[PDB]
Design a protein around this ligand. Structure first.
Ligand SMILES: Nc1ncnc2c1ncn2[C@@H]1O[C@H](COP(=O)(O)OP(=O)(O)OP(=O)(O)O)[C@@H](O)[C@H]1O
Ligand SMILES: N[C@@H](CCC(=O)N[C@@H](CS)C(=O)NCC(=O)O)C(=O)O
Ligand SMILES: N[C@@H](CCC(=O)N[C@@H](CS)C(=O)NCC(=O)O)C(=O)O
Ligand SMILES: CC/C=C\C[C@H]1C(=O)CC[C@@H]1CC(=O)O
Ligand SMILES: CC(C)[C@H](N)C(=O)O
Lengths: 214, 569, 214
């Protein structure tokens, strides 16, 4: 069974879990201690030592989105993540990168930082949610007629919407009910109903991180 | 002592004595050489009374492959004598190939004698046609900056270097040439591309006294001027502040130029003004040296296409064609240099060797035996066969020439040849396609610099353990080493076959050496070859060197503008 | 006629040009004055305002890696950059991500910055070229048995190698030669042999950047 090296509060890790559960692939979950990384994490990824990593066919797949595309490519039989056309997947990749960078940067500035950068990060986050909300025009999902690619890429941040609502002191529902609710629709799915850890745990965790580093 | 009337008279008498001089030439060659082991197998002892008949009926014709082991024997640690005789002070290679592989030819002082004399006589005849000032100078894009030593401790050499670094070249040529502008060291700088930049500079340096523009070839003159089109502004920059371009790095030439530079701002105004006035640079040579009477060079046969680019450079300046011969043998001299190149013909000088001609008059080819030099037929085409002090005895060079006419009793020859071509299977390959592809792959790293690779060559060094390969390259400018080292790696990586892989990865064949050479090396190879006595079919330059090719070989070592052992591997 | 919004020293624009030329498309190049980003570009990406941008069917395609895989999917009959297997594709994308992060930033450090920043960037690019050298291992290329996806992705950096060698005053070949070596190997493809500008000019651009910011 495919082995996932993952971190329970990590959104990207959640991305990998989401792809496998959305598909129907059965696997074994592994929790790593980045304090004491297992020989499998060190032997799969001798460079970055990051997660997630999927070991399938005795072959490792590192990085979260790379893993998602690996899952869609490995299992092109039932639930297709991307549209058929080059351009649709194209827009999907463009968007996956956008959520992956500026959205992730802004959010990271929301939960892991203080002061001026937090305010800046907040303004950036609300504009970023605005751009997401606008791109969808008002789209149920993001990557296909069903649950899609960057739906998977962004949904894991829905487990952190609570953390941002609390630390950033903003309502992404009052200002963008559509995105939070996009997430809460996606929440009816087991891929989101079982993979994204409780928001309470994440909230306490990000705060606890805030405790450890100054 | 060079004088005009006496030498031309002696020359006329000599050319009327063409048959006698030729036969006696045979006699002096063999009296010099009764001992050759090649001859023992033919049955020779000399003298007697049916000598020419004996040599022609007893000595078999020979090819490059057959002559290869013997002169090879002379070069590699067996410093020993064989085809002519004495271990020679230098050795050659021949254009076209010897079964794709390399061919050696002996060098002796006689060839130098032939050199001063053909130049002496020809200069007298041309100075007769294009009289110069005895106190001027000339533009000679001549080079001989390189000298290699054969793996046997023996010198192996090109025509040029052997001439120019010869103990008799300076004093002998002092009288029959207008003094060179470049210091001999610039001529022999370890960087002839930078030195060519310097040559352009030096010739350009004494223009008012400059009497002729010289390159053996149209190819060289053309290369020089297209280069000038590229670098004239730079030339202005270098000359003006009394400080040369940072492009030049070799300390000997740099030191000499520094001995030659002080800050001068006015003249820049001049050069820029004139140089912007021309129409696509037509007639530059008369522009640079307004009083040159001529452009001198080999303009016929395969040089004919470059005569126009050159003509364009030369404008209306009369074009005078140079004579025909080489270290493998001198054949003809133009004694009526005023004739234009299309119609130019060169007359044979009789004591430089003993020559025979195979007619193409049957069909293609034809089983006719060789007939005598003055027995050759007017307007027909024959192949030149050579016997001289160059390890050549009744040797088939493989080139076809046509007799246009006669100067007194000596024949006038014409060359519409290009390649002495049929080919055979090699060993200095790495398929010619693989090697060309190799330079092509590595060279574009140079192309990143707006520079294109004009030519290349190679060598196998087996004095070394493990032995290694040497790649030679001619490029359009001075550049940095890091890109060049990268290139050597690419040549190595371009030898795509599984075999080379096996060797160098195994290290039993040593790291390839890219010894990068300067501008005019391959120009030097071409310049020697077309002038080589026979007929213009002398331009398929052999691409890689087995320890049996020497013309490229002398021009191998000293101008290692850089030379390296791969840091990879 | 595919319209490309390109920048002369854009390693990324080069990723696009190399990708398209590699494939077999006849297309048009437009040089950009980023001081005056053009009206079609401001409509292609009104926020990033970044190139390369290939326009097909009147539909703007953005981001270099996105653009090259766009290249793959746009004409799927002749020259594929990926191999047949999903894992191979994952490997190529993985390495693509590799070229995009520490490698790009490290070079950016070597030719864009000096001193304390510089040394860190220098050990960074030597390390990157090393892991790089290790993964190249032996293959003529990277993404398949022939010219690949990533081949396109990192080859374009090899005209800047000169700039790195000089400001860095290094020589990245004695520490890792098979790489630049592979690079001038990759120059023989008509895709990059006509898409990439001269290195002395690139060096000069780096020099202009440096002269402006000391
Ligand atoms: N065509 C020619 N050009 C220049 N020098 C020539 C030529 N022919 C004969 N020589 C003369 O030969 C003698 C030197 O050239 P040289 O004979 O050394 O080289 P080599 O070892 O025989 O073989 P090669 O020139 O073909 O490489 C010199 O005097 C030289 O002038
Ligand atoms: N592209 C990678 C980078 C992500 C990253 O850095 N993830 C964290 C997990 S949240 C990680 O692996 N950190 C390694 C560490 O703790 O040193 C991904 O998306 O997984
Ligand atoms: N990953 C991007 C990087 C692109 C990038 O940073 N481009 C710069 C060129 S250095 C740019 O367009 N900058 C906009 C500007 O500086 O005006 C790509 O591959 O295109
Ligand atoms: C006797 C001539 C000595 C060297 C001759 C060389 C020149 O300097 C002019 C070319 C000539 C080569 C050639 O004609 O064979
Ligand atoms: C004298 C000289 C330039 C000769 N023709 C050569 O190139 O070897």
């Amino acid at each position: 069974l495919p082995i996932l090296l993952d971190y329970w509060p990590s959104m990207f890790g959640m991305r990998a879990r989401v792809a496998l559960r959305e598909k129907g692939v059965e696997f074994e979950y592994r929790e790593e201690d980045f304090s004491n990384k297992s020989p499998l994490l060190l032997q799969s990824n001798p460079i970055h030592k990051k997660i997630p990593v999927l070991v399938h066919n005795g072959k490792p797949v590192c990085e979260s989105l790379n893993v998602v595309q690996y899952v869609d490519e490995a299992w092109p039989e039932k639930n297709p993540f991307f549209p058929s056309d080059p351009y649709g997947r194209a827009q999907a990749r463009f968007w996956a990168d956008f959520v992956d960078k500026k959205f992730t940067d802004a959010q990271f500035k929301v939960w892991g930082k203080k002061g001026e950068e937090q305010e800046a990060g907040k303004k950036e986050f609300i504009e970023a949610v605005k751009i997401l909300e606008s791109e969808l025009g008002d789209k149920p999902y993001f990557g296909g007629d069903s649950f899609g690619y960057v739906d998977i890429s962004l949904i894991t941040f829905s487990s952190w919407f609570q953390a941002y609502e609390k630390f950033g002191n903003f309502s992404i529902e009052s200002e963008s009910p559509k995105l939070i609710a996009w997430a809460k629709r996606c929440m009816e799915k087991e891929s989101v109903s079982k993979s994204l850890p409780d928001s309470e745990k994440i909230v306490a965790y990000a705060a606890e991180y805030r405790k450890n580093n100054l | 002592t060079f004088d005009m009337n006496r030498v031309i008279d002696e020359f006329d008498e000599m050319t009327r004595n063409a048959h006698q001089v030729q036969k006696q030439t045979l006699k002096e060659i063999l009296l010099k050489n009764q001992s050759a082991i090649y001859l023992q197998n033919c049955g020779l002892n000399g003298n007697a009374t049916d000598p020419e008949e004996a040599f022609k009926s007893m000595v078999p014709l020979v090819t490059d492959v057959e002559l290869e082991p013997y002169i090879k024997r002379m070069v590699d640690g067996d410093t020993s004598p064989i085809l002519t005789g004495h271990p020679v002070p230098a050795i050659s290679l021949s254009s076209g190939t010897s079964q794709g592989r390399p061919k050696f030819i002996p060098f002796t002082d006689e060839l130098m004698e032939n050199t001063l004399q053909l130049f002496r006589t020809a200069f007298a005849f041309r100075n007769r046609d294009f009289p110069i000032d005895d106190n001027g100078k000339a533009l000679q894009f001549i080079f001989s900056s390189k000298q290699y030593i054969s793996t046997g401790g023996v010198p192996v050499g090109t025509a040029t270097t052997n001439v120019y670094r010869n103990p008799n070249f300076k004093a002998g040529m002092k009288s029959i040439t207008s003094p060179s502008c470049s210091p001999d060291e610039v001529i022999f700088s370890p960087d002839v591309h930078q030195a060519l930049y310097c040559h352009l500079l030096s010739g350009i340096l004494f223009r008012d006294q400059v009497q002729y523009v010289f390159a053996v070839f149209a190819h060289g003159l053309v290369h020089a001027f297209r280069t000038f089109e590229q670098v004239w502004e730079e030339i202005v920059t270098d000359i003006k502040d009394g400080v040369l371009s940072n492009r030049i790095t070799v300390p000997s030439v740099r030191t000499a130029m520094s001995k030659l530079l002080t800050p001068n701002p006015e003249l820049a105004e001049t050069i820029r003004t004139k140089c912007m006035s021309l129409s696509n640079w037509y007639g530059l040579i008369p522009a640079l040296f307004p009083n040159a009477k001529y452009v001198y060079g080999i303009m016929t046969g395969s040089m004919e296409p470059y005569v126009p680019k050159l003509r364009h450079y030369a404008g209306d300046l009369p074009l005078v064609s140079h004579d025909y011969g080489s270290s493998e043998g001198w054949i003809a001299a133009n004694v009526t240099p005023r004739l234009s190149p299309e119609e130019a013909t060169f007359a044979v000088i009789p004591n430089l060797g003993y020559f025979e001609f195979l007619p193409v008059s049957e069909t293609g080819e034809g089983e006719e035996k060789p007939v005598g030099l003055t027995q050759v037929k007017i307007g027909e085409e024959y192949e030149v066969v050579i016997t001289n002090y160059a390890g050549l005895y009744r040797y088939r060079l493989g080139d076809v020439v046509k007799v246009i006419g006669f100067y007194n009793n000596t024949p006038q020859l014409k060359f519409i040849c290009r390649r002495n071509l049929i080919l055979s299977i090699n060993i200095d390959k790495n398929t010619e396609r693989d090697l060309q592809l190799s330079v092509e792959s590595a060279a574009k790293r140079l192309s990143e610099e707006k520079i294109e690779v004009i030519d290349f060559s190679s060598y196998i060094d087996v004095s070394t353990d493990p032995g290694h390969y040497a790649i030679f390259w001619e490029i359009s400018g001075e550049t940095n080493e890091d890109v060049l080292q990268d290139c050597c790696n690419c040549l190595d990586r371009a030898f795509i076959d599984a075999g080379y892989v096996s060797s160098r990865k195994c290290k039993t064949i040593g790291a390839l050496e890219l010894r990068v050479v300067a501008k005019g090396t391959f120009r030097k190879i071409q310049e020697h070859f077309l002038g080589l006595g026979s007929s213009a079919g002398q331009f398929k330059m052999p691409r890689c060197v087995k320890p049996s090719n020497a013309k490229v070989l002398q021009i191998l070592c000293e101008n290692v503008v850089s030379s390296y052992f791969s840091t990879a591997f």
